[model samples]
Target: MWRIELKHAVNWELKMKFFVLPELPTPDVVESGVWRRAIVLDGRAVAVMAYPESERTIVVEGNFENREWEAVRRKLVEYLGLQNPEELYRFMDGDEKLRMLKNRFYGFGRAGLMSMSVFEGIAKAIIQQQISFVVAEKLAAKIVGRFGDEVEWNGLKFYGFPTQEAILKAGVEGLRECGLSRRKAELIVEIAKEENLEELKEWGEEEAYEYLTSFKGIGRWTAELVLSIALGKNVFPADDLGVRRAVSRLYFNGEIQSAEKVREIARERFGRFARDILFYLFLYDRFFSKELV
Candidate 1:
């Protein structure tokens, strides 16, 4: 019964809300203001409970070994996006487009991303290729339920994302049973066989992009997603359909544009803040427009 108080001055409750948004939900449960998820280590699922006790403090607790608990603490902090909120807010305030977005959803600037490892990001990107997010999420949940480790702690269940080894153990045929396309399953298996995907973190952006695209199923969109989600780089995935739609609805008067056009617009209009703007635009389209409350 170890309790860790990871204190940071950020809007963690808003971050939790972001994670639970209807359009983009993570595989974590939030109940009674506490966020619960499992951090799988050494093929064992370790339960973790996290909650914001104050505007400045988030408390994380679980019953696990000291080293496992340390890893959980670090991963939770990363997933919760406890980065430089002040700097992001400053950038947002300076941009007219982002200023309107920030004012519309106040505190959203503090809503950090739900981070994952390079392998998980690659697997998820593969799973999401050419599918609606609704179906993609269902498939992802199925994969988790099938291959992931589950644990019960404090009368609650926590599920961890499947590791690369777990995916490899399942193989393509086994993954096909989890409602993945044959191509997707094969791509996932190929990805799982690699022990060096995380090394992309050490490569330069263009180098990493080229390396990832060298994989059969990986492309511009998938590579950008991996860079942003896994490496925490602020790269806008302009080729994404959701980003296209979001940018269309927000700036182009609902007139959809080509991916190349959107990419150019994003590069010109948003500059370095493009990724953050892209996130908010997607969030607004999915979560905020109808109910501004």
Candidate 2:
């Protein structure tokens, strides 16, 4: 474990689960046997263990070199939303409900995103669709362990998300062994072969959406999710089952709600930062959101 520090002020416990929650929960950070998290840096698996070192700094442990490590750190800083807390709240204004969320969760409601590229994000969205969080996590683990390579630190092996090339190499039939259905397997294979993927990131939301949804399996929801969850664009997919369910719980007192109703509420409340609000709802439902405590 190489001890390293981050460039921004961060509440480690609050932001740590911005990467891993629901699939697991806060006990991992404060009560579970381990506190480590995983991220890919420089095309390799970097198992990270992080904590706040001071009011304006974060400490991280991982295997990395100067350049790739700097790249990874820069990404962390962006995800941490350190540069735009004021902007985020300037948009929020006097929204009382959001103020409650801010008081409960920390860092002025700017949550770090799960860092992902086009390939990683889209693939993960497919893997997770319609499945229970824990089940998807297990299946994802199996795929990563089998198709992706691993790195070791502190006597434990950390696996990268399976590479697109390797998943393509696995092909449809091989993907089925890792718990993918034949249709999803075919879709995964299709996703792997997308040649213009990097271009999707270079384009704006509309062009990116058209490019992604032009494919067979990619749909509107998945496309929007890719832009927000994977690419970290400031957009929302209010139609997501979890987001809808979470909206119901927080606003409707745990009664499951209509998709149409939820979308309207989300659009009205969050406005431009709907995606960021969804991230908070994700934590609210997943972690029971004890971040402020």
Candidate 3:
């Protein structure tokens, strides 16, 4: 077994709320304050377990080579959202609406950006477009179950996120069985064939945006999500259906608004914390509010 210690982090239990809310089917298990998932390396799946050892430390456990451990360490840092959230808390407290949501949610401010690799982020973002998260998650699960690497460790089976190579080998028709549309399957295939996407994490937001949208299947919404999910940027994908709905319901008395209008409001009101604010609002809309049209 190997361990990575994350220090000076927020309470691990509070941070775990990001995975607990609006619970849907997932490859990772979050229970008893421990998060268990699989991290794929060299076409093999390694089952990883993470839990807080103290108020300011998160311990990640797995088994792998020293070189492999370096990659796993980097992933766990982003996966666990080890960054301090005090700045986000200060920003949230300044707005009455966000303050209320933060108070209600209790740990919204501490939830760090749940990030993934640029390739994975883009592929998953493409799968989620124009679909409900429930459906998207189910489809993604099917893809992972079928094409992703898997391993049985300590009597528990763990599955990794589907690799681009796996998806490419599956072909578009094979992915269609997982509930992906033809266009989306093709897009995922295209994404898999490209090897340069990981570089987006280092690109400036503007350059990243232009490069992402240059793809035939990507647009503003997809690009914005890549910024947040892969780069951990604070930008919000205002064009997201959930974001638009959350903004309209909270600010417009359930009156649906155009994506453009919602983007304007998010930029004006939430500023730098746009994505963070949207996270709480989206959760509120999903689990707290009445049904919307």
Candidate 4:
């Protein structure tokens, strides 16, 4: 067992943010305990992970196959924002409404970045388009069970996110078997093979938006979802239904806001921290009373 402590000077309440939803990718795979890989720090890997909610400090269990606890701990701390509370706090403080919202919902400045792979992020987003969140999660589970590689830990089976090659080789027919539409399957393959995948890693918010939008199936909404969730870009997700509803309740008195109005509000109110603003809004919508929205 490996232990680490992460402190947040601005608002200590930030530590309890690691709630694994049934809809998320890693938990879905790890539930079975088959596949094994590195825990990511930002986009890299961490050896272990622990949270305060787990009785003071959490332990990140090291893999017996490839142990690199020291390196993983260093990367995990960096990725968790333990070493840069000031930068995170500054980003969270830029927008007054976001600051208030964060305090109310998260009880901290902001949750650190969700360290998910781009493939998992995009594939889940594609699966979720137009469908309910529950159904999308089911489909994702089926896909992982069907194609994701499996590994055994302590005699338990775990699954990992399917590789790009695995996904591409699955072909459209295989994806359809997993309940994906032909278009979604095609888009996934296209994104996997995209020549500019590296460029996206280096692109700033605007440049990344442009690059993502240039693809055939990607649009403003999809691009924003990927940018915010996968790449950690600080742009609001204007196309999210939950975000729309939250803003509507907050400003429009339950009347749904038009897409254009959402864009206007996000741009004016959130400015640079629009992405985190939307994140807090979604978190609030999910956790707090639905009556509030």
Weakest 10 consecutive residues, lDDT, candidate 3? 17-26
Candidate ranking under TM-score, highest first, comes to: 1, 3, 2, 4
lDDT of each residue in 1-293, candidate 2, tens digit only: 33344344445556655655423321122333234445566555666555555656555566665556666666656655544466566665557766666667776346554534567677777777777666666776667767865667877555566677788899999889978888888888898987857556668888888877887877878888888877777667866887877778778887889878987887788887776777777777776622258
Q: Per-residue lDDT of 1-293 in model 1, one digit per residue for the tens?
A: 44444334655555655653223224566776777767766656678777766666667778677767667766666666665567667877876767878777666554344445677777877888998766877787788777876888788778767888899999999999989999999999998888777677778888888878999888899899777767666677878877788777777888999888988887877777676676677677667532258
Q: What lDDT score goes with residue 204 in model 2?
A: 89
**lDDT against the true structure, each candidate:** 0.72, 0.66, 0.73, 0.61
lDDT of model 3 at position 75: 77
Candidate 1 — which pairs collide?
A: none
lDDT of 4 by residue, 133-225 (tens): 667777876777777666555554545566666788887889998889999988887877754453464579898888778878888888888
Model 2 poorest 10 in a row by lDDT: 25-34
Error of 3 at 35 (Å): 1.6
On residues 96-153, what C-alpha lDDT tens digit does candidate 3 reach at each position? 7777777777643433444456776787788889887667778877887788767777
- Of candidates 2 and 1, the better by TM-score: 1
Q: Estimate each model's TM-score.
A: 0.86, 0.80, 0.86, 0.75
- Rank order (by lDDT, best first): 3, 1, 2, 4
Measured on C-alpha atoms, candidate 2 has an lDDT of 0.66
